[PDB]
Amino acid sequence: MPKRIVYNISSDFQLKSLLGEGAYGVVCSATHKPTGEIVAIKKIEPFDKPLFALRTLREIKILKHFKHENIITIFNIQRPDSFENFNEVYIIQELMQTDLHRVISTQMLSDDHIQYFIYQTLRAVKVLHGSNVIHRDLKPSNLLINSNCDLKVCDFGLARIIDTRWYRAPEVMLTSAKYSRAMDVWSCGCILAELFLRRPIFPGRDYRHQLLLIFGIIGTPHSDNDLRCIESPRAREYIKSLPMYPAAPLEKMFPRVNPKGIDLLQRMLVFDPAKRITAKEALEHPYLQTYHDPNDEPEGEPIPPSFFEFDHYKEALTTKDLKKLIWNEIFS
Ligand SMILES: Nc1ncnc2c1ncn2[C@@H]1O[C@H](COP(=O)(O)OP(=O)(O)O)[C@@H](O)[C@H]1O
Ligand SMILES: [Mg+2]
């Protein structure tokens, strides 16, 4: 518990350990004295840029609205004592043991575990997509895991309601990419790839490098038909200035990996977003039959765009505007 970590929270809590520290959030476990229960508290200081406040608002509205076995459970949100003093947001949630990035880099995983993790990740993506929400930042560190391997997705601040570059879909990097469910499926494929390979599959240093590593594996879109899904004719030019790589032979690349797993993986890492398998289909794929239960996979209920009506504001919301919005979401 670095001393330089201060939480203006109810004294009922005793900070125990530091679990994460970024430019947006800081997460620590903490004991709740009245019950003895250990929890996790995500502290956010969102009022220096509108971007951080928008991210904060989207994240708590999502966490307060969604209830699903594979979505992190929120217990409550600290109640600020006054509006003037309100400068930090403290989200109190169920404590999880670790996250998938930590497991992947510290554990050898059996096939059964890889199947179960990717399965739960897809089950969460399905309910979000069914509710017309795309996460947009799916990666192993945002997949929380506890001892019995239950997985729960977290970090919902970048979500959007429809209509790290290492896990980003190519379409997102070639143009003013439209938000689509397919970009989450692409990240899911990068995560499945990482589970098999035991390290990230496309660790690009920059945008150029990233595309280089990507086509290296899936094949360079050659024919016009392939590039017709790319809006910016210049973007198409860029692609053509690339080597014409052939789709790598994954069975030979991952000789110790379950073939069905390989098959599912190639249906996810497809250049053309429209040709990418959907979350729902992926749950129905043979690789996951041990876990698939079409009567236990919530389809979701549509959320209107007005749920984040502020994402469409013409004259960009002021920080004070955003502060009242966050405050009202906390007290409701
Ligand atoms: N509920 C939780 N239980 C245990 N660890 C957590 C929990 N929430 C977050 N963490 C840890 O904190 C890290 C960062 O949290 P995250 O919510 O993704 O915030 P950030 O926006 O900073 O990435 C995670 O990668 C994980 O290791
Ligand atoms: Mg995160």
Swiss-Prot record:
GO terms for molecular function: ATP binding; identical protein binding; MAP kinase activity; protein kinase activity; protein serine kinase activity; protein serine/threonine kinase activity. Pfam families: Pkinase. Activated FUS3 initiates a feedback signal, down-regulating phosphorylation of both, FUS3 and KSS1. One of its GO terms (cellular component) is mitochondrion. One of its GO terms (biological process) is positive regulation of protein export from nucleus. Its cofactor is Mg(2+). Its EC number is 2.7.11.24. Its main location: nucleus. Keywords: ATP-binding, Cell cycle, Cell division, Conjugation, Cytoplasm, Isopeptide bond, Kinase, Mitosis, Nucleotide-binding, Nucleus, Periplasm, Phosphoprotein, Serine/threonine-protein kinase, Transferase, Ubl conjugation. It is found in: Nucleus; Cytoplasm; Periplasm. It comes from the Eukaryota. There is a cross-link at K324 (Glycyl lysine isopeptide (Lys-Gly) (interchain with G-Cter in ubiquitin)). SMART domains: S_TKc. The active site is at D137. Activated by tyrosine and threonine phosphorylation after pheromone treatment. It catalyses: L-seryl-[protein] + ATP = O-phospho-L-seryl-[protein] + ADP + H(+); L-threonyl-[protein] + ATP = O-phospho-L-threonyl-[protein] + ADP + H(+). Residues 13-288 form the Protein kinase domain. Transmembrane segments: none annotated. The TXY motif contains the threonine and tyrosine residues whose phosphorylation activates the MAP kinases. Together with closely related KSS1, FUS3 is the final kinase in the signal transduction cascade regulating activation/repression of the mating and filamentation pathways, induced by pheromone and nitrogen/carbon limitation, respectively. Phosphorylated FUS3 activates the mating but suppresses the filamentation pathway, whereas activated KSS1 activates both pathways. Pheromone-activated FUS3 functions by inhibiting the binding of the transcriptional activator STE12 to filamentation specific genes while inducing its binding to and activity at mating specific genes. Present with 8480 molecules/cell in log phase SD medium. In the nucleus, FUS3 forms a complex with DIG1, DIG2 and STE12. The interaction of FUS3 with STE12 depends on the presence of both DIG1 and DIG2. STE12 is lost from FUS3/DIG1/DIG2 complex after pheromone treatment. During its activation and phosphorylation, FUS3 forms a membrane-associated complex with the scaffold protein STE5, the MAPKK STE7, the MAPKKK STE11, and the G-protein beta subunit GBB/STE4; interacting directly with STE7 and STE5. Belongs to the protein kinase superfamily. CMGC Ser/Thr protein kinase family. MAP kinase subfamily. This is Mitogen-activated protein kinase FUS3.
